[model samples]
Target chain A: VLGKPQTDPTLEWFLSHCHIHKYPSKSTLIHQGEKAETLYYIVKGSVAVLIKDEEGKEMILSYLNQGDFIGELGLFEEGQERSAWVRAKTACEVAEISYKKFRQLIQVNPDILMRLSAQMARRLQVLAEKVGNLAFLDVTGRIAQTLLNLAKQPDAMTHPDGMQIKITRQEIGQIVGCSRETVGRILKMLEDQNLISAHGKTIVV
Target chain B: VLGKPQTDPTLEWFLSHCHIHKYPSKSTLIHQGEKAETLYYIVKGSVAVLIKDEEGKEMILSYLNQGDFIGELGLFEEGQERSAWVRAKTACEVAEISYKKFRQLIQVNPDILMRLSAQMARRLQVLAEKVGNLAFLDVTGRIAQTLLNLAKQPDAMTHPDGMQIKITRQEIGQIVGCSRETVGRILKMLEDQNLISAHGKTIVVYGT
Candidate 1:
């Protein structure tokens, strides 16, 4: 989740203390296993969080669009490996702040500290919810949960019946730990019950 | 996980900024759904982290012992629920700081900021690992995972075979989403295979 650009100069002033960098779509912004020495703020566009297991099987964790921050593991914890790879979903610009500089930045401006802390709190909430869902939900219930999460996306548009999310069955499978065929069948079952309507590359939920 | 009391005077100096409060064993430090206005530092004893769902099913998330901090949800995020309840496992002496005061404390002392931030990172790491395990491992593997985690506890002792952990079958089941019977069977299977040896409340992991 991303913070809204606030009315206070807090957002503007914090960007001044950072160095700006831009990346083309599909470029890797943060590499898994790299030392997290810098934290990146999403000034423009979006990025995907991807985690890979030891066997190199990968899954999409979530997306952080504009106004979201990335690479915070280094901000608090030292000598940490970047837990996941962040890839630009579109041409993007990010404000980069080093661990050393971030400490100085937060002390000078407690507003920035609150912003970062709030972001951490929001993340903890979402992760905890995901843990609970994984522990408690069956496949159909998990898929429904994923749809509800997508409907909360900052950029998603409202459909007449529900928010129409642009996603593939394969992608949904990756997020909910099911197969593409299973996700397709479930969507059809959901549609049969008039819960959702699906089309190529998009589903209204 | 808890930090070992450090020598840098950072931990000592931080205690000076807080108000010390004592709690009897089993007393609740933070209640779920309550406003997170205060942050706690465990100067003495330990506490268990617990989360409850809407239907009232509760599970232990983890434990925070001496040198561990709690109730930070309010420190960063404003006007939020405590998310989980923390109960003292033993008589506790904690240094408490309000959110308003913590903002001031960190600006004057960046060391405290680092300590708090690192603790946040540790929590994030553990929760993420739990998510991965739940999404991946089978029932047996999850139980084994829980044992490996318990073996890393600060109060646990080493056995000749491996580090021994004191945990009940019910607790293992709660941690891994299995029945007590399943945990018992798996532990029995593990013992039969010479992977682990269980006696009374303790289980020793022999390197496998």
Candidate 2:
């Protein structure tokens, strides 16, 4: 939408090497366990990384908007299977860099691989934090973290008292990694603790 | 102990470009939030990756032994901070490759960076699995997964009926992401459900 690519020199290289395509909302941009041969750079709209548990229930690992890339995992690891699924949340435009072009890009600009790896490391840190939270934090703590995360979003508003997050109980459940129904009782628990109070649209934290 | 690195060409490049040092047991090989400039290749002994969350409670992410490497995370991205702490589980010999050598190594052998990143991605996948397990599974399911994990370890014995993991309640609690007292009740619950039967030294699950 903006001149974002010009700011990043590597994106300039990738733009030339990549082919652009569009996906409709709810489309499977990347499928788990399939061959990962390309990395998709989102230029428009957003997508979510989804994974299924043993019981076949799905949970979101992350949601990526424009300027984020996915499918970097298996493309290099043994030229192997995709680790997770990336699905379109809205009709999206993406720049797909295939394996051949990726190889060329890395060889020509060796530092690019390091940059990508560094980005992966950052994600690993977040994933580790999530793992630690699941172990150390109760549902209440998880909710608090999720609420803060929502408040940090661009859509959240500034209030006189505190930050306001406009989101739903259903979304809070997904971000908290809990069940939707479980959120109702937990919100009540938070209210009792005086930690938070929610109105119809704005949640004060 | 074995000639583990020879099978991988990337390790060969790293070995020659690196310096060797010995560290005592419980030594911090890599500290969290420090400037990350070197990648340490474990030549001897083992280390565990540790992280702490709110309330300052710590958890082990994964353990590493010979053939494993650490500190690759920060050296590349914005020349950033170390993501996790790596502490020596036992006295260890390590080959440390500094940032200059790392850049040179990548220039000489570009595929090496890809392979290292692939390894990081693999670890990410495991971490994601851990996150999923903690969220989706109950204490029982977590224990089941933890048990299976232990049974797959190098020292675990192969039995006729099922694999034998000789471990203690304290160790199980560490792996299961719960407390020792909590483990006692869970094991009793599992026993009541006929899910697993634990003896003095053996726990059976075949594939639970």
Candidate 3:
């Protein structure tokens, strides 16, 4: 799911000091409200960022594919617990770097700090959009917007008419903050209107 | 309003290169979706970050007091437009640094980059909590939570009963995404329950 693989001396240096770790599908990588000590760089596959509410209902915040990074939030706020859970959506490979090592690297190579800052800024932009959508849009509009967003991801398969998104109605509901039945109803309506088509877990839009 | 004054060398350096500007109360500082070119460091007074929906309803995202910085979101994504509007809540003095100068300063003083990164992270954490609250909490609970948050601000006044917050019902409504009427009703409810006391615009919370 990575974009064009680029070779950078800085990334190479960081990778040299990092250890690779593999996780099976559906594995938990980080838990919400737990002390965070490590940062992860995705080598392959995808992961999900999730937040659980007081009633224990979970919501999917976002998905990270290959070439993405996670766990930087913990490093940014020292001694702070993680605000969300990160889980592998598929078998994943990642480079693990301790917060201590990351701080040292940033002290020596401040460019890396700028890079991480840019990443956080991009994330903040996305979250701000999501918040706006949640505040203003109705469920159907939100789902439509979310589908378009998923289509723009690096790994989405493009077709002549639309893109193929391999996600379930339940997961879509989780992201859109609605019930699965509502997602099903909306999908059926959209399909009837030729806006999108669904085949089991695959949504073509 | 300011926190305990702490001397930051990087901030001092940036300010030395900036030009100062003044705005009257309620003046707009930055517009949503406009090209962001300047980074503003508050020298005095307070400002509000706001967003407007498609229907043109406005909501206040947060309030930034003295010692706070704004317009970093644009710097993070070069050529990116601002996502929210910044307006002066009171007459304000700010030191303005153009995006170009900010970039050069960071290149020479990388420690400044780290400091800004920390600030962005803190903002992200607050936004994350706001997102969670929007998803999970009801209107009253959200208002309650917001009041607690505002009470914790470095500028809030402490009282024997609780804390004094100098904000109007309309402003509180904007922050909580509710109507001013709803905010008034809720405040009365809270006062009736002895959860909080309202004296015009000020609110004092009792230990729950």
The lDDT of each candidate is 0.78, 0.77, 0.81
For model 2, the superposed segments whose C-alpha errors exceed 4 Å read A1-9, A54-56, A152-155, B1-10, B166-168, B191-201
Count of steric clashes across candidates, in order: 0, 0, 0
lDDT preference between candidates 1 and 3, better one: 3
RMSD (Å) per prediction: 4.0, 3.3, 3.8
Native-structure RMSD, model 1: 4.0
For model 3, how does the per-residue alpha-carbon lDDT over A1-205 read when each residue is reduced to its tens digit? 2323565777877877899999999999888888989988998999998887777666777888887888888786679888788999999998999999989998788877777788887887777767776655667888888788878889888777778887788888889877788889998888887888788544565
TM-score of candidate 1 relative to the true fold:
0.84
Worst 10 residues of 2 chain A by lDDT: A1-10
**In model 3, what lDDT does residue B134 have?**
70
Best by lDDT: 3
- The segments of candidate 3 whose C-alpha lies over 4 angstroms from its true place after superposition are A1-6, A137-166, A179-205, B1-4, B202-208
| Cα lDDT, model 2, residue B205 | 58
Report the C-alpha displacement of residue A49, candidate 1, in angstroms. Answer: 2.0
Candidate No. with top DockQ: 2
What is each candidate's fraction of native interface contacts (fnat)?
A: 0.28, 0.68, 0.49
| Docking level for model 3 | medium
lDDT by residue (tens digit), candidate 2, B30-137: 888898788888888988888876565567788778877788776665557787788997899999988777877777787777767877878877777777777778
| lDDT, candidate 1, A112-178, per-residue tens | 7667767776777666666666656667988888887887888667877778888888778778766
- Per-residue lDDT tens digits of candidate 2, residues A154-182? 88888876788777777677776777678
Candidate 3 chain B minimal-lDDT segment of 10 residues = B1-10
Question: Looking at model 2, how many pairs of residues clash?
Answer: 0
